[PDB]
């Protein structure tokens, strides 16, 4: 199970490292949980629609969302983090 | 450029987040530098061989190495390890 960040999602994760470590911890918990149970668990996961269909979202806080997609089958999967800051 | 962790190297990174912020900073700097110059710069990047050909290592500290691969096209920096040595 690989963890994949984009340029922008890693930048915002770094931003949290620089400004609020509590948010970093929440995001790490969301990651841990989504790798285990992609569609259930922490942060009230909900599927996005339209051009973001395959993507899912969980709450970090009311103002900040963790958007991701788990891809791959069986034993070689990946979680792609698309956003970890702001609304969708 | 996308940043890829394995289960093992993310566990390494989390371990540093839990235990030593200086290491997290040093790792973040190596990631940053390797995104702009994958085979040169901070930490004295050297290419590994044989068993681990295609991989590269940079020094985090005396006893900890940052080991990574670059794969891809139009790219990915894959962090394979960032705790311990050999």
Residue numbers in the entry:
A (entry chain A): 1 to 88
B (entry chain B): 1 to 74, 77 to 88
From the primary publication:
Type II TA systems are the best understood, and contain both a protein toxin and a more labile protein antitoxin.
The structure of the YoeB toxin from A. tumefaciens, herein referred to as AtYoeB, was determined at 1.75 Å resolution. When compared to the EcYoeB toxin, there is an overall RMSD of 0.6 Å for the core residues with 1.2 Å deviation overall. The AtYoeB sequence contains four inserted amino acids, located in a loop between beta-strands 4 and 5. The YoeB dimer interface is well conserved among this class of toxin, largely solidified by two tryptophan residues from each monomer (conserved at positions 5 and 10 for both At and EcYoeB) forming an aromatic ring cluster, in addition to polar interactions mediated by conserved Tyr13, Gln17 and Asn18 side chains. These changes generate additional polar interactions for the AtYoeB dimer.
